């Protein structure tokens, strides 16, 4: 059977980037060219592999990470980047093998007066390691006095909502992102390109 890419790419809602979703894809035929040839994706950037060679490769498993961020932040979903998203939300490794796919989702993910459902981690003390996921919601201590679960001065809830309104400039508009990654072990290959 064909790999269930539609479940990922056509999901009604995407995850918040701080709580980014990972879907394991396995035991199926992947036709990557159908993704790469699509006029839907404004970003389709592979690292450590060329898109036109994917259909010729077999992997143990494939993984699809997905989430929403601002247009201006899509550039952070790449090896070697810094900023609030790369540092505190979703971190690719410096030498990455995989593909980053993104498309404007203003028609789905903005709302008149604002869609506030999509969040990002604004406050964190240190950077994420590659592929780390932090879903904690402890009150963030910004001074020397402990917060003890109470918000206030120097005591901040660590997540913030994007304000996605349809009239936003493109850099402030929501983008849906899928990062494909590939796994090769001393195990049977379960995801190959079409025969």
């Amino acid at each position, epitope marked *: 059977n064909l790999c269930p890419f539609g479940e990922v790419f056509n999901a009604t809602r995407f995850a918040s980037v701080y709580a980014w979703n990972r879907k394991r894809i396995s035991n199926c035929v992947a036709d990557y060219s159908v993704l790469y040839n699509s006029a839907s994706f404004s970003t389709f950037k592979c690292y450590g592999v060329s898109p036109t060679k994917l259909n010729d490769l077999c992997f143990t498993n494939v993984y699809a990470d997905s989430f929403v961020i601002r247009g201006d932040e899509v550039r952070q979903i790449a090896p070697g980047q810094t900023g609030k998203i790369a540092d505190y939300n979703y971190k690719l490794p410096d030498d990455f093998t995989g593909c980053v796919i993104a498309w404007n989702s203003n028609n789905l993910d903005s709302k008149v007066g604002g869609n506030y459902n999509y969040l990002y981690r604004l406050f964190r*003390k240190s950077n994420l390691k590659p592929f780390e996921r932090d879903i904690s919601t402890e009150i963030y201590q910004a001074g020397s006095t402990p917060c003890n679960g109470v918000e206030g001065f120097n005591c901040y809830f660590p997540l913030q909502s994007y304000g996605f309104q349809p009239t936003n400039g493109v850099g402030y508009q929501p983008y849906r992102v899928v990062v494909l990654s590939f796994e090769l072990l001393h195990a049977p290959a379960t995801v190959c390109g079409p025969d």
Partner: single-chain antibody
Amino acid sequence: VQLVESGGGLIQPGGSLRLSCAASGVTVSRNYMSWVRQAPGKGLEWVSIIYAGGSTFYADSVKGRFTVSRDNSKNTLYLQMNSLRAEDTAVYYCVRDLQDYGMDVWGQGTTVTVSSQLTQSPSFLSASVGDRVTITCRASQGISSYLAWYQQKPGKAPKLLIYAASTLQSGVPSRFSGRGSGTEFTLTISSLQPEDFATYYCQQLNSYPPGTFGQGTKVEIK
């Protein structure tokens, strides 16, 4: 809570300075910390930022020449300023940067003298005590509610009034209000008081490039 800048002075072009910002009541290493400067008679210009996790970013006007850094054991922020130019002349402010919630803590500034988009309307306004005063800030694209307002009294550091376009900063008098979403934003002072004669700045939050300020509206007597 205070930020105390030092290290400024009078120098010729080509020289170097190091600014220090000693913090108390906020922890430099746990915060976004920015440097913002203001040339004499001009508006605010964001210079650099350092993240809690260590990332640094710079205005194009200073890239390659300035370096922001910190010493956690001294709770101190630094700005190393090399290859200084006449146009780097300004007061340099240390600020604690809350991003979506504006720049809420400002130092008093240190003066550097080197010597051999958001549009506010009007640029100048004359008013009387008790007047209702409104100032408008217009963005070049839709920015939702990503706007802050600041007041800067003559000789003083700016003070945060409003963030998220309409949220009153804690401790700020209720006669200040902000409205707007999208491209057009207004600050209203419901009954102007003698202490309210100042210059007001809007700021586009989480902007690209970072730290976009309007050019300021000066509210003056009569």
